[PDB]
Amino acid sequence: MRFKDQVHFIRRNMKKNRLRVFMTILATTMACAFLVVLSSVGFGIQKTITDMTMSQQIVTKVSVMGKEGDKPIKKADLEKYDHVRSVVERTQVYEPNKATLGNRTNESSNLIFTNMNDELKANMELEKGRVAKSENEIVVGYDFAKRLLTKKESEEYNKKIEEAKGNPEDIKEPKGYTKDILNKTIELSVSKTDSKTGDVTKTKTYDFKIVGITKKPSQDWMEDSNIFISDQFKKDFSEFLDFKGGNVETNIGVFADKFENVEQLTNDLTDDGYYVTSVTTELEGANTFFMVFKIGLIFVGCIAVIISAIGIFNTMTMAVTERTQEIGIMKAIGASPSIIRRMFLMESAYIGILGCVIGIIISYGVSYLVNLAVPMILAATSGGDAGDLNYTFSYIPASLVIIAVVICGGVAVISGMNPARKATKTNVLTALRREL
Amino acid sequence: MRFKDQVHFIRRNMKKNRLRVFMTILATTMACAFLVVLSSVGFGIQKTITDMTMSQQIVTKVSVMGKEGDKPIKKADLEKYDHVRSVVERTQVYEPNKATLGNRTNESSNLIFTNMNDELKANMELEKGRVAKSENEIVVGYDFAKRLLTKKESEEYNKKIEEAKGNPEDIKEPKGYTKDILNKTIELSVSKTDSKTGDVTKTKTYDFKIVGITKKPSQDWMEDSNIFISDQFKKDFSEFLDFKGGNVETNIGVFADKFENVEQLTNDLTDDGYYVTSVTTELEGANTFFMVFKIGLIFVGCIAVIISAIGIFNTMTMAVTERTQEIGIMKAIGASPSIIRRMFLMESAYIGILGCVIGIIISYGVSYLVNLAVPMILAATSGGDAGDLNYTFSYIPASLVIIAVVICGGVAVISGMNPARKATKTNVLTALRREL
Amino acid sequence: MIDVQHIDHSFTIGKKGRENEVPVLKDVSLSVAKGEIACIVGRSGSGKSTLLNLISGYISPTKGRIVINGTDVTGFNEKEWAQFRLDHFGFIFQSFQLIPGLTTYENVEMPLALKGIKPSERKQKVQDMLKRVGLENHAAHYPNELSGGQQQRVSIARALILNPSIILADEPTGSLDSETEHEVLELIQQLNRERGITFVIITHDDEVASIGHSKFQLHDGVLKGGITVEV
Amino acid sequence: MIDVQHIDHSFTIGKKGRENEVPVLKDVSLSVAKGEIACIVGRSGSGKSTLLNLISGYISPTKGRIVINGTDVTGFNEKEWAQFRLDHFGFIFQSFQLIPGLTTYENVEMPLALKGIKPSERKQKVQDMLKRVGLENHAAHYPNELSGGQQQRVSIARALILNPSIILADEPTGSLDSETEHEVLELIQQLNRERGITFVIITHDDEVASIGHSKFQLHDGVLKGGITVEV
């Protein structure tokens, strides 16, 4: 039997009971939409958690604490790994800074000295200027002018912070300097602390020219106003501003390719015994719970789908019993049990698949409505931008559509399998003769 | 037609298609079990949050911290309401304290000012001691030995904590004091913080008799090292150790006799509205959120129940079509539209009600299974033995069973309404002429 | 008594735009008193079937009024007409209308259950009526296991179970042999001679009509030849 | 050309605790030649219906073997029996066994749809098959809107459209008029005359049997008087 012939026969036998076929299709549609929306709630929870993690952290910063046994981590070996863009060797020393450029000054300006060739070759943050190469030359951040302000403005800032009394609401101080910082002779005066601990020996005269500005700090996080120094001063920094015993904290970035490559690098480094942590670390930490939640919601949708498949089975048993006579005549002519079984399995799977398709459409609509409603209800507390939180249900049935179609079609086939066997096991003699 | 005859006809007609009416009853049963289990998840969440609220703190607290308008909050105006069992007044003291008994000093202690008469009318859980109604009588806290560590022991414990940094490892120390906590008439570092601000005047230390000890606090994790200074001594304590104001946090309690008395005290607001943080005021918002959650879960189950309702309608139109001859000659005899409509509405209602009863029994079984497996899962997965706590992740009150019965019977009757009208409007002429 | 006069009916067949009205009954003046077998004789689809439908209560006549037992039934709604059919009507339809499935005992008891008779009274009435008709020695015998004559007999027994004034029938022997025809006809005659019961039997055979106390021949939709010739 | 050598079959009707094996066949040795109308005349339950259902493929014989067109069909399963019925069989059942709905053109085309013939040749095939039978001016006429005779003719059309070699039939005039029976039997005669085809018609009579080229009488199951009666 040709496929077109089977479709025509299904059309003929479905036009007989338009109301019943439409009602079982509607039951399947409600079950599929219910499954998709319910599992979409979990998919959206996973997506919003992943998006929040990816937004509150830089994705590619695969930070490694070290190796088991406190083995030192060399710079050379990190380069010879799979698909590594470049390794970041940023060094931070916990100490206040007394830059004091002319009448202006900066306070935090924590030291970020490191070999800048590797950093700028690791897609570092910058928009203007040149990398620090000369002896008296550094790269400055963007918020440097925010803290740069005259001596009277510094006294005003000090009075404001003293009178703040731990109330950072009336602390809106003027920016001060609103001009170009490039090509200047800032007399940097980084504070000493007897190298590391407590005594303050002598603050060097880092008369370093300003060439190089960093752009806006990452994804609306971290303060970039801190001064960045190259590797040219490493020798005298270790000689005078000794930091090795304690105060030093050299965070390691290990930048790389797209997020899947980040995950591959993370698991490769973990297999070696490294103390790896990144966005994928938290993602995998929550991923077991997210998989469990998605499986549970899909199983709840599955019991709803079984509720609808029982109705499909009732409809198909009444379709087999209702005719039994077209089936009897086809079997008498020689339609074969295989063709009849394929016919009725096709009818059951068509009910299930039409129900699943329009349930997918209705569930896309319902997920869009939920995306338009959840912020509209939960605003004024955390959805100030409204482009966050449940702004996830547009893509959600990407593999969920495939899973829903597979589940609903398969369960419809299971429900129609018994009526198909009934149809193929109709006795020709009894079916042909009338039943008075 | 009475009722026995109608039931006999319904049973006779349902016996014709056992595998179809059983499938419809199975679909309805699974939908009712689905609705009850899903709504019982929210009901159990509400029940376990309420139980956690009762267990975490004292059931009767009625704290009035945070008076608006800076109006007086003196106890003299706080005693006259409906059957208020206690008007206990508390003013915590922030002073440097250490048990001056040998080499063991209790650095951590929270002095509490209370009159023992208000304590007796408050019925606070007391492990030892009758009352301390004297100028120099106190009741120590339950954890008076754990926090009473020697100077060397505290120093080595702090050094070990620093060795492990902020990581909460297995770092532990013995429970300090090991002798009896009986009546010793000991003194605990009443040393002034310049009465309360900043200077530390002459030390001074009263000698207080330890009448008794307090019982275990409302929770195991939180500690307690109270001293329970008498309120008769509060006058002289204010006179000499002036702490009033901020090194002062008022913790006045309005404890009533029972929980229903707490509810009536909460009803008696808008006059004692001192930013009450009682269990009922806190639980009102939880009750609102849980009403929203239970309504949402009821609707979510109602979707899967409407699926089985559509299945019921399918099988009921199936029954009407199969019963056209019997209905036709019954109308010919004079069965009346009312009797036939009642018969078919009763068949649909019987399908729905039997499904609902079987599904409610199955839902009780599933809720028992969930309540038994959830603590096991929590113990197994996140390596914590479920915290040795009692939770009810699935609770089915009689109210939920009533809503389930009403909803499922109603949807079954609604499904049968259209087949009932079809069976009443049979057009007896057609059914009395057979077919061709 | 049955009072039918100036009664006409029309049937509309087709779509809304193809409503074709073909009147059938033309001022029928059927008049039957209590305790006689009336009969309507006409060809198939000539107008006897629709007249029996109106007199039974399945269709409300378009014009005129019908009075049974001194009560007007044209204005009756479905509920009231069904209530009247319960307590003052009986039926012997041709197709034997015997609920494919079920049993003979319950087929006979069905109108008793519909009216609301108590169980033991129902048992007594069913047993007595099945004894009277003659099919008492079958009990729970399924209708499919009976012959057509026995089906007609049990249909008559069902009709008599509520001792109604009228047991108006369709063609009781439309599909029956001549011997069973004579048996059913003499059974109906004995019904009238034992208990005074009006009959509105409709048939297309004059030999079946001969047993009646009155003749009413309907020719192509209009009644004629209304007499009361004694047999 | 059909060979039925030493075939018997018994009806095991009843419950598991109420088994009752009533043999309806008693070792028949029916033989049919190619291109002839073999007629097997018997009685209701004699064995004609059982023999036709056995040779058709609905019933597997308990003992013996059957050769159809030089092919053993005793051990055939449902799939191969149905395939055989598809490519080499045709059916003219008594009730005409037409699908409700399924307009006469589609009703005739139905076996081609079953076999898998593409619609392009299907249209023309159904057209000339309907023309040959004599119902070509019907097109989209439902079988329920036809008469019994023309229903039998369109059943024949559905039989011949696949061009089979055996067109075994039930009583082709079981519910037919005398004139319709005469014309349908004449149609079968012209059918065998013009196109080589074998008929295994079973009749409950003799006037229809006289058309056949052979007589096979089934007196309760045993074949007697099996000769090639020239027409």
DSSP string, B238-305: HHHS---SSS--B--B---SSHHHHHHHHHS-SSS-S----HHHHHHHHHHHHHHHHHHHHHHHHHHH
Distances (CA, A) of C150 to C103, C136, C156: 13, 11, 10
Crossing angle (nearest 10°) for helices C148-160 and C178-194: 10
Integer Cα distance of A183 and A205 in angstroms: 18
Tell if the CB–CB gap between A333 and D86 is shorter than 8 Å. Answer: yes
Nearest Cβ partner for B27 among A20, A26, A310 = A310
A108 CB contacts (<8 Å, ≥6 apart)? A96, A97, A147, A223, A225, A226
Q: Taking a C-beta distance cutoff of 8 angstroms, is the pair C161, C131 a contact?
A: no
Instruction: Give me the residue label for tokens 């087929």.
Output: C107
DSSP summary character for residue D211? G
Sign of CA dihedral A190, A195, A201, A207: negative
Structural domain boundaries, residue D45: 1-79+194-231
Integer Cα distance of C41 and C218 in angstroms: 6
Q: Taking a C-beta distance cutoff of 8 angstroms, is the pair A196, A242 a contact?
A: yes
- C183 domain-assigned: no
DSSP summary character for residue D18? T
- D137 domain-assigned: no
Other CB atoms within 10 Å distance of the CB of residue C208: 23
Nearest-CA distance from B310 to chain A in Å? 6
Instruction: Give me the residue label for tokens 């479709």.
Output: A7
Q: In whole angstroms, how large is the CA radius of gyration of chain B? A: 35
Ramachandran assignment for A102, one of left (phi > 0), alpha (psi -120 to 50 degrees), beta (any other): left
Q: What is the token pair recorded at B130?
A: 């009758």
Measured in degrees and rounded to the nearest 5, phi and psi for residue C64 equal 85, 180
- DSSP H or E segment with residue C193: helix C178-194
- Does residue C151 sit in the same domain as residue C126? yes
Other CB atoms within 10 Å distance of the CB of residue A294: 19
Mutate to test the interface with A, among D114, D122, D154, D175 (most CBs of A within 10 A): D114
Residues of B in contact with C83 (CB under 8 A): 334, 336
Give me the DSSP letters along A245-281: TTTEEE----EESSHHHHHHHHHHHHHTTEEEESHHH
User: Of all residues in chain B, what percent are helix, strand and coil, respectively (each to 5)?
Assistant: 50, 5, 40
- C190 domain-assigned: no
Q: Taking a C-beta distance cutoff of 8 angstroms, is the pair A23, A333 a contact?
A: no
- Does residue C170 sit in the same domain as residue C229? yes
Half-sphere CA count of A93, side-chain side, radius 13 A? 27
Residues of A in contact with D113 (CB under 8 A): 1-2, 5, 8-9
SS3 state of residue C151:
helix
- Does residue C53 sit in the same domain as residue C110? no
Among the listed residues B30, B17, B133, B109, the one whose alpha carbon sits nearest the alpha carbon of residue B360: B30
Nearest-CA distance from B309 to chain C in Å? 29
Q: Taking a C-beta distance cutoff of 8 angstroms, is the pair A141, A228 a contact?
A: yes
Q: Taking a C-beta distance cutoff of 8 angstroms, is the pair A44, A302 a contact?
A: no
- Does residue C99 sit in the same domain as residue C76? no
Half-sphere CA count of A342, side-chain side, radius 13 A? 13
Q: Where are the beta strands (DSSP E) in A141-235?
A: 187-188, 206-207, 209-213
Tell if the CB–CB gap between B311 and A311 is shorter than 8 Å. Answer: yes
What is the per-residue burial (b if ≥16 Cβ within 10 Å, else e) of B42-57?
Answer: bbbbbbbbbeeeeeeb
- Does residue C72 sit in the same domain as residue C101? no
Integer Cα distance of A360 and A357 in angstroms: 5
Residues of A in contact with B23 (CB under 8 A): 310, 313-314
Tell if the CB–CB gap between D102 and A12 is shorter than 8 Å. Answer: yes
Distances (CA, A) of B160 to A69, B25, C192: 20, 67, 116
| D-C interface (Cβ pairs under 8 Å ≥ 3) | no
Q: What is the token pair recorded at C106?
A: 């319950």
Q: What is the token pair recorded at B2?
A: 């009475």
Q: What is the token pair recorded at B188?
A: 């605990």
SS3 state of residue B349:
helix
- Exp. method: cryo-EM
Q: What's the total number of domains in chain C?
A: 2
Q: Taking a C-beta distance cutoff of 8 angstroms, is the pair B68, B260 a contact?
A: no
- Does residue C8 sit in the same domain as residue C31? yes
Integer Cα distance of B34 and B38 in angstroms: 6
To one decimal, the resolution in angstroms is 3.4
Q: What is the token pair recorded at C153?
A: 């007999």
Integer Cα distance of B182 and B396 in angstroms: 49
Nearest Cβ partner for B34 among A303, A315, A318 = A303
Integer Cα distance of A318 and A321 in angstroms: 5
Distances (CA, A) of C230 to A397, B50, C211, C213, D204: 87, 93, 10, 6, 47
**Is residue D34 annotated as involved in ligand binding?**
no
Burial of D130 (0-12, 13-18, 19+ CB in 10 A): buried
Other CB atoms within 10 Å distance of the CB of residue D148: 16
- C152 domain-assigned: yes
- Does residue C70 sit in the same domain as residue C101? no
Distances (CA, A) of B328 to B323, B405, B429, B430: 8, 33, 8, 8
- Does residue C99 sit in the same domain as residue C129? yes
Among the listed residues B234, B207, B241, the one whose alpha carbon sits nearest the alpha carbon of residue B96: B241
- Does residue C131 sit in the same domain as residue C44? no
Mutate to test the interface with D, among A11, A325, A329, A427 (most CBs of D within 10 A): A329
Half-sphere CA count of A287, side-chain side, radius 13 A? 9
CATH for C53: 3.40.50.300
Strands B104-105 and B149-150: antiparallel
- D37 domain-assigned: yes
Q: What is the token pair recorded at A342?
A: 């394929």
Among the listed residues A13, A318, A17, the one whose alpha carbon sits nearest the alpha carbon of residue B19: A318
Burial of B281 (0-12, 13-18, 19+ CB in 10 A): middle
Integer Cα distance of A154 and A132 in angstroms: 29
Distance of CA A264 to the CA centre of its chain: 16
Nearest-CA distance from C130 to chain B in Å? 18
Strands C10-13 and C20-23: antiparallel
Q: Taking a C-beta distance cutoff of 8 angstroms, is the pair A18, B302 a contact?
A: no
Nearest Cβ partner for A333 among D78, D95, D114 = D114
- C186 domain-assigned: no
SS (H, E, C) C72-124: ECCCCCHHHHHHHHHHHCCCCCCCCCCCCCCCHHHHHHHHHHHHCCCHHHHHH
- Does residue C116 sit in the same domain as residue C219? no
Distances (CA, A) of A403 to A44, A310, A352, A355, C181: 16, 20, 14, 14, 69
- Does residue C80 sit in the same domain as residue C108? no
- Does residue C118 sit in the same domain as residue C76? no
Sign of CA dihedral B289, B290, B293, B298: negative
- C184 domain-assigned: no
Integer Cα distance of B272 and B64 in angstroms: 8
- D6 domain-assigned: yes
Q: What is the token pair recorded at D144?
A: 């329920």
Integer Cα distance of B128 and B134 in angstroms: 16
Tell me whether D113 touches chain A (CB under 8 Å): yes
The alpha-helical segments, DSSP class H, found in chain D are 48-56, 78-88, 104-115, 119-133, 148-160, 178-194
Dihedral angle over CA of D101, D102, D107, D109, nearest 10? 180
